[PDB]
């Protein structure tokens, strides 16, 4: 026997309130006042419903109004022993929800100082010395946030033509291919691990304030784009056909090392550089490519076909660490959010569709899964700093630079009827690849 509902959201579960998905019930839609009711249910505690709600709630509720209605949930009026038994765990759930909130989603409070003020006021209001001794934990979490050994030692850093410290002489054919793939895998794994779910939920990276709300995601995407462009620029600006096949071969070797290190982001970097307009038509250059590397590149390219069928397969099969490809996740998230209704309607009443939010949360979780295990590879500071300050475009813009690349391709390999002119050599050092199998 709870209150009269004129002092609570105690209205019993109805079809105008909640609908579940055909041993805890999976909520599929419901009025917000009952959504939080199930979030702080007395019958049972649902930790995954908490983890999913607090990650995907801003799309139908602002942090302030959530704090307000959870405070409204914590303040229960009495109509006895039965009812105190009921009141205890509801308040417990509310306080553990606040704990999870400040723990895993503290940004909501860094962007709203008054939200933190309300939270601190609210936790300073709980009474019952036992409960308050338990509340000190949330207090300490707030105060905190306001202020790996592998089996064998990682393999040696490999060098080729550039001796360590000679950063001036760093380039694609100067550094060892294996180490190029390694340092790129490290940088891209760090970029992939830095992306937090607050930058994907709500499709916020596609809206006008994407620079503000998705800085790490855009940083990683720009890195991969920049490297694809650098690959094309190395191929096409190498006007001598001999050196140009050298460049293409080293790039295919780096693709091999990517395939091995399970760095699929870098694999796609390379195969995009190959599928570009300026590079895809260099018939006279791919002619001289060994067949064993042609099959490597073909196996890589087949990963994206039929909507990345083989990529999804291989990613689900391999053992991490790995740098998966992000674009697929982003496409799926955007299409779920903009392809499913924001609310369901029943008996003329609007209920927040939560299933959609749960699916987006699943995609977020699969992103976070691969962010755990790091790479057992030693970083070289200066090679990393070489690939961090690479600017193929320079001061040019997208169209200007794309056209420069395509026109350079036309220059080094004119269309059929015209004969292939030969160019002088660019690189005054040997072009033999030092293999792609390590030293020892």
């Amino acid at each position: 026997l709870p209150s009269a509902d004129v002092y609570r959201f105690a209205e019993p579960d109805s079809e105008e309130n909640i609908i579940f998905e055909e041993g805890i019930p999976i909520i599929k839609a419901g009025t917000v006042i009952k959504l939080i009711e199930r979030l702080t249910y007395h019958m049972y505690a649902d930790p995954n419903f908490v983890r999913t709600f607090l990650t995907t709630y801003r799309s139908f509720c602002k942090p302030q109004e959530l704090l307000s209605l959870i405070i409204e949930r914590f303040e229960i009026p009495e109509p006895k022993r039965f009812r105190k038994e009921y009141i205890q765990p509801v308040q417990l759930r509310v306080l553990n929800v606040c704990r999870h909130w400040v723990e895993h989603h503290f940004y909501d409070f860094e962007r709203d100082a008054y939200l933190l003020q309300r939270m601190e006021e609210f936790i300073g209001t709980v009474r019952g010395k036992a409960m308050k001794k338990w509340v000190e934990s949330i207090t300490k979490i707030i105060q905190r946030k306001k202020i790996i050994t592998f089996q064998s030692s990682p393999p040696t850093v490999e060098w080729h033509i550039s001796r360590p410290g000679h950063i001036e002489t760093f380039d694609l054919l100067t550094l060892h291919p294996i180490e190029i793939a390694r340092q790129l895998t490290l940088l891209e794994s760090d970029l992939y691990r830095a992306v937090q779910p607050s930058e994907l939920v709500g499709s916020v990276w596609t809206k006008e304030d994407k620079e503000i709300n998705s800085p790490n995601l855009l940083k990683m995407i720009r890195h991969t784009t920049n490297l694809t462009l650098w690959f094309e620029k190395c191929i096409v600006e190498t006007e001598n056909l001999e050196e140009r096949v050298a460049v293409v071969s080293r790039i295919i070797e780096i693709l091999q090392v990517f395939q091995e290190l399970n760095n699929f982001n870098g694999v796609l970097e390379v195969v995009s550089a190959m599928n570009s307009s300026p590079v895809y038509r260099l018939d006279h250059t791919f002619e001289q490519i060994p067949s064993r590397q042609k099959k490597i590149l073909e196996e890589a390219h087949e990963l994206s076909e039929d909507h990345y069928k083989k990529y999804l397969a291989k990613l689900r099969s391999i053992n991490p660490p790995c740098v998966p490809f992000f674009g697929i996740y982003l496409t799926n998230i955007l299409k779920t959010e903009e392809g499913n209704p924001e609310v369901l309607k029943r008996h003329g009443k609007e209920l927040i569709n939560f299933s959609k939010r749960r699916k987006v949360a699943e995609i977020t979780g699969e992103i976070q899964q691969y962010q755990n295990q790091p790479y057992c590879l030693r970083v070289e500071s200066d090679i990393k700093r070489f690939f961090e300050n690479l600017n193929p475009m320079g001061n040019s813009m997208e169209k200007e630079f794309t056209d420069y690349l395509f026109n350079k391709s036309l220059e080094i390999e004119p269309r059929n009827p015209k004969p292939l002119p030969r160019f002088p050599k660019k690189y005054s050092y040997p072009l033999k690849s030092p293999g792609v199998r390590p030293s020892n």
Binding site: M274, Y280, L282, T285, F286, I289, K294, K295, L297, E298
Partner: peptide, 7 residues
């Protein structure tokens, strides 16, 4: 298709 032919 593709310059990376195969046979």
């Amino acid at each position: 298709x593709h310059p990376w032919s195969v046979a």
